[PDB]
mmCIF file of N, CA, C and O in Angstrom:
data_model
loop_
_atom_site.group_PDB
_atom_site.id
_atom_site.type_symbol
_atom_site.label_atom_id
_atom_site.label_comp_id
_atom_site.label_asym_id
_atom_site.label_seq_id
_atom_site.Cartn_x
_atom_site.Cartn_y
_atom_site.Cartn_z
ATOM 1 N N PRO A 1 195.428 31.116 -87.643
ATOM 2 C CA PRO A 1 196.267 30.436 -86.688
ATOM 3 C C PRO A 1 197.739 30.412 -87.113
ATOM 4 O O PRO A 1 198.040 30.760 -88.256
ATOM 5 N N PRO A 2 198.646 30.028 -86.208
ATOM 6 C CA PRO A 2 200.034 29.911 -86.634
ATOM 7 C C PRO A 2 200.165 28.750 -87.617
ATOM 8 O O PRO A 2 199.261 27.912 -87.738
ATOM 9 N N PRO A 3 201.293 28.683 -88.318
ATOM 10 C CA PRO A 3 201.475 27.616 -89.301
ATOM 11 C C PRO A 3 201.610 26.247 -88.675
ATOM 12 O O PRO A 3 201.869 26.101 -87.453
ATOM 13 N N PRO A 4 201.486 25.194 -89.508
ATOM 14 C CA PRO A 4 201.691 23.875 -88.960
ATOM 15 C C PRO A 4 203.089 23.723 -88.390
ATOM 16 O O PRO A 4 204.053 24.225 -88.977
ATOM 17 N N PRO A 5 203.209 23.036 -87.248
ATOM 18 C CA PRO A 5 204.527 22.857 -86.679
ATOM 19 C C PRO A 5 205.368 21.807 -87.439
ATOM 20 O O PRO A 5 204.850 21.035 -88.254
ATOM 21 N N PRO A 6 206.657 21.813 -87.233
ATOM 22 C CA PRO A 6 207.497 20.758 -87.856
ATOM 23 C C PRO A 6 207.223 19.444 -87.143
ATOM 24 O O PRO A 6 206.724 19.433 -85.986
ATOM 25 N N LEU A 7 207.612 18.357 -87.788
ATOM 26 C CA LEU A 7 207.522 17.070 -87.165
ATOM 27 C C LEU A 7 208.640 16.921 -86.236
ATOM 28 O O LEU A 7 209.778 17.325 -86.547
ATOM 29 N N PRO A 8 208.371 16.337 -85.047
ATOM 30 C CA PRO A 8 209.441 16.162 -84.089
ATOM 31 C C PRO A 8 210.369 15.086 -84.598
ATOM 32 O O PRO A 8 209.960 14.302 -85.469
ATOM 33 N N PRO A 9 211.603 15.021 -84.047
ATOM 34 C CA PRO A 9 212.630 14.060 -84.464
ATOM 35 C C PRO A 9 212.160 12.597 -84.454
ATOM 36 O O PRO A 9 212.583 11.811 -85.304
ATOM 37 N N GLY B 1 182.415 15.125 -78.312
ATOM 38 C CA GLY B 1 183.442 16.180 -77.955
ATOM 39 C C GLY B 1 182.996 17.157 -76.877
ATOM 40 O O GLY B 1 181.787 17.398 -76.732
ATOM 41 N N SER B 2 183.937 17.765 -76.136
ATOM 42 C CA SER B 2 185.351 17.939 -76.561
ATOM 43 C C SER B 2 186.381 17.182 -75.717
ATOM 44 O O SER B 2 186.302 17.147 -74.485
ATOM 45 N N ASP B 3 187.399 16.666 -76.387
ATOM 46 C CA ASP B 3 188.492 15.985 -75.750
ATOM 47 C C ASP B 3 189.673 16.921 -75.514
ATOM 48 O O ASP B 3 190.769 16.456 -75.205
ATOM 49 N N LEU B 4 189.480 18.237 -75.669
ATOM 50 C CA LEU B 4 190.600 19.159 -75.539
ATOM 51 C C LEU B 4 190.462 19.965 -74.267
ATOM 52 O O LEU B 4 189.384 20.448 -73.964
ATOM 53 N N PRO B 5 191.554 20.153 -73.534
ATOM 54 C CA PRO B 5 191.480 21.098 -72.435
ATOM 55 C C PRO B 5 191.221 22.523 -72.934
ATOM 56 O O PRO B 5 191.519 22.867 -74.075
ATOM 57 N N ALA B 6 190.680 23.361 -72.065
ATOM 58 C CA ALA B 6 190.456 24.739 -72.384
ATOM 59 C C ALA B 6 191.779 25.361 -72.827
ATOM 60 O O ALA B 6 192.857 25.068 -72.304
ATOM 61 N N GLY B 7 191.673 26.233 -73.804
ATOM 62 C CA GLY B 7 192.786 26.910 -74.389
ATOM 63 C C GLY B 7 193.328 26.322 -75.654
ATOM 64 O O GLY B 7 194.051 26.980 -76.378
ATOM 65 N N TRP B 8 192.926 25.095 -75.952
ATOM 66 C CA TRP B 8 193.401 24.366 -77.149
ATOM 67 C C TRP B 8 192.328 24.336 -78.224
ATOM 68 O O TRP B 8 191.130 24.183 -77.921
ATOM 69 N N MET B 9 192.749 24.406 -79.491
ATOM 70 C CA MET B 9 191.886 24.108 -80.593
ATOM 71 C C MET B 9 192.633 23.251 -81.606
ATOM 72 O O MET B 9 193.852 23.330 -81.735
ATOM 73 N N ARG B 10 191.884 22.488 -82.371
ATOM 74 C CA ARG B 10 192.383 21.849 -83.567
ATOM 75 C C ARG B 10 192.467 22.845 -84.717
ATOM 76 O O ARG B 10 191.610 23.722 -84.834
ATOM 77 N N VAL B 11 193.507 22.701 -85.553
ATOM 78 C CA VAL B 11 193.704 23.487 -86.743
ATOM 79 C C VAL B 11 193.928 22.605 -87.943
ATOM 80 O O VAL B 11 194.712 21.671 -87.872
ATOM 81 N N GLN B 12 193.128 22.837 -89.002
ATOM 82 C CA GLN B 12 193.211 22.104 -90.241
ATOM 83 C C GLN B 12 194.364 22.559 -91.124
ATOM 84 O O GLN B 12 194.643 23.775 -91.315
ATOM 85 N N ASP B 13 195.117 21.587 -91.622
ATOM 86 C CA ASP B 13 196.080 21.810 -92.662
ATOM 87 C C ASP B 13 195.999 20.680 -93.671
ATOM 88 O O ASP B 13 195.507 19.630 -93.357
ATOM 89 N N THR B 14 196.525 20.896 -94.868
ATOM 90 C CA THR B 14 196.583 19.850 -95.879
ATOM 91 C C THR B 14 197.330 18.633 -95.343
ATOM 92 O O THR B 14 197.032 17.489 -95.711
ATOM 93 N N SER B 15 198.312 18.870 -94.461
ATOM 94 C CA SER B 15 199.162 17.798 -93.950
ATOM 95 C C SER B 15 198.618 17.087 -92.724
ATOM 96 O O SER B 15 199.173 16.119 -92.229
ATOM 97 N N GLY B 16 197.482 17.581 -92.237
ATOM 98 C CA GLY B 16 196.867 16.966 -91.060
ATOM 99 C C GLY B 16 196.362 18.018 -90.066
ATOM 100 O O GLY B 16 196.541 19.214 -90.247
ATOM 101 N N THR B 17 195.704 17.532 -89.036
ATOM 102 C CA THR B 17 195.207 18.383 -87.961
ATOM 103 C C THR B 17 196.318 18.516 -86.953
ATOM 104 O O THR B 17 196.914 17.554 -86.490
ATOM 105 N N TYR B 18 196.572 19.738 -86.539
ATOM 106 C CA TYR B 18 197.474 20.049 -85.409
ATOM 107 C C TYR B 18 196.722 20.754 -84.307
ATOM 108 O O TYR B 18 195.527 21.044 -84.421
ATOM 109 N N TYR B 19 197.429 20.929 -83.201
ATOM 110 C CA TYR B 19 196.825 21.444 -81.971
ATOM 111 C C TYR B 19 197.501 22.750 -81.605
ATOM 112 O O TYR B 19 198.738 22.792 -81.554
ATOM 113 N N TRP B 20 196.693 23.754 -81.319
ATOM 114 C CA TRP B 20 197.168 25.063 -81.034
ATOM 115 C C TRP B 20 196.674 25.501 -79.618
ATOM 116 O O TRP B 20 195.473 25.472 -79.376
ATOM 117 N N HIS B 21 197.606 25.859 -78.749
ATOM 118 C CA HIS B 21 197.257 26.390 -77.441
ATOM 119 C C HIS B 21 197.312 27.928 -77.574
ATOM 120 O O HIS B 21 198.400 28.506 -77.590
ATOM 121 N N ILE B 22 196.153 28.528 -77.674
ATOM 122 C CA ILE B 22 196.078 29.968 -77.981
ATOM 123 C C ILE B 22 196.828 30.831 -76.990
ATOM 124 O O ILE B 22 197.545 31.742 -77.396
ATOM 125 N N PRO B 23 196.687 30.571 -75.672
ATOM 126 C CA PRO B 23 197.315 31.514 -74.717
ATOM 127 C C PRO B 23 198.799 31.548 -74.806
ATOM 128 O O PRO B 23 199.336 32.547 -74.454
ATOM 129 N N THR B 24 199.484 30.474 -75.164
ATOM 130 C CA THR B 24 200.938 30.441 -75.198
ATOM 131 C C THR B 24 201.512 30.409 -76.604
ATOM 132 O O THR B 24 202.709 30.559 -76.783
ATOM 133 N N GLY B 25 200.706 30.217 -77.620
ATOM 134 C CA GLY B 25 201.206 30.047 -78.987
ATOM 135 C C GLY B 25 201.765 28.671 -79.277
ATOM 136 O O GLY B 25 202.296 28.411 -80.377
ATOM 137 N N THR B 26 201.683 27.736 -78.374
ATOM 138 C CA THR B 26 202.237 26.411 -78.580
ATOM 139 C C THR B 26 201.463 25.710 -79.716
ATOM 140 O O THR B 26 200.247 25.748 -79.748
ATOM 141 N N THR B 27 202.223 25.034 -80.609
ATOM 142 C CA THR B 27 201.586 24.171 -81.627
ATOM 143 C C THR B 27 202.290 22.842 -81.619
ATOM 144 O O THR B 27 203.498 22.785 -81.402
ATOM 145 N N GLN B 28 201.534 21.785 -81.799
ATOM 146 C CA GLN B 28 202.078 20.426 -81.790
ATOM 147 C C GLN B 28 201.174 19.497 -82.559
ATOM 148 O O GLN B 28 199.994 19.754 -82.727
ATOM 149 N N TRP B 29 201.705 18.359 -82.959
ATOM 150 C CA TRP B 29 200.938 17.329 -83.676
ATOM 151 C C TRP B 29 200.240 16.336 -82.766
ATOM 152 O O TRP B 29 199.306 15.687 -83.190
ATOM 153 N N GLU B 30 200.698 16.172 -81.522
ATOM 154 C CA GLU B 30 200.130 15.203 -80.622
ATOM 155 C C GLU B 30 198.961 15.843 -79.901
ATOM 156 O O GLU B 30 199.048 17.000 -79.489
ATOM 157 N N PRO B 31 197.861 15.124 -79.735
ATOM 158 C CA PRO B 31 196.768 15.648 -78.946
ATOM 159 C C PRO B 31 197.237 15.997 -77.546
ATOM 160 O O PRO B 31 197.948 15.230 -76.908
ATOM 161 N N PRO B 32 196.798 17.133 -77.009
ATOM 162 C CA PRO B 32 197.154 17.533 -75.665
ATOM 163 C C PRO B 32 196.483 16.676 -74.586
ATOM 164 O O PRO B 32 195.389 16.198 -74.810
ATOM 165 N N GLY B 33 197.129 16.483 -73.448
ATOM 166 C CA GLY B 33 198.430 17.062 -73.134
ATOM 167 C C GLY B 33 198.429 18.372 -72.349
ATOM 168 O O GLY B 33 199.423 19.094 -72.415
ATOM 169 N N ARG B 34 197.355 18.691 -71.604
ATOM 170 C CA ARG B 34 197.400 19.851 -70.679
ATOM 171 C C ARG B 34 197.300 19.517 -69.166
ATOM 172 O O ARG B 34 198.340 19.397 -68.518
ATOM 173 N N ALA B 35 196.104 19.397 -68.582
ATOM 174 C CA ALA B 35 194.829 19.604 -69.250
ATOM 175 C C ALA B 35 193.960 20.590 -68.462
ATOM 176 O O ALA B 35 194.309 21.771 -68.349
ATOM 177 N N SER B 36 192.823 20.123 -67.940
ATOM 178 C CA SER B 36 192.377 18.737 -68.106
ATOM 179 C C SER B 36 191.262 18.647 -69.144
ATOM 180 O O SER B 36 190.277 19.386 -69.080
ATOM 181 N N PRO B 37 191.409 17.714 -70.095
ATOM 182 C CA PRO B 37 190.593 17.610 -71.293
ATOM 183 C C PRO B 37 189.167 18.123 -71.108
ATOM 184 O O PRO B 37 188.420 18.192 -72.082
#
């Protein structure tokens, strides 16, 4: 799968 | 289960479970959010 996403602001 | 709309899966990481919408490549931390679950 794609990597973990960043945390939103 | 399942509480996910079609096209979504949970993905395991050390930092937590995230949500991946395979058809669009979308990834997010919040449960989807499509749907319909």
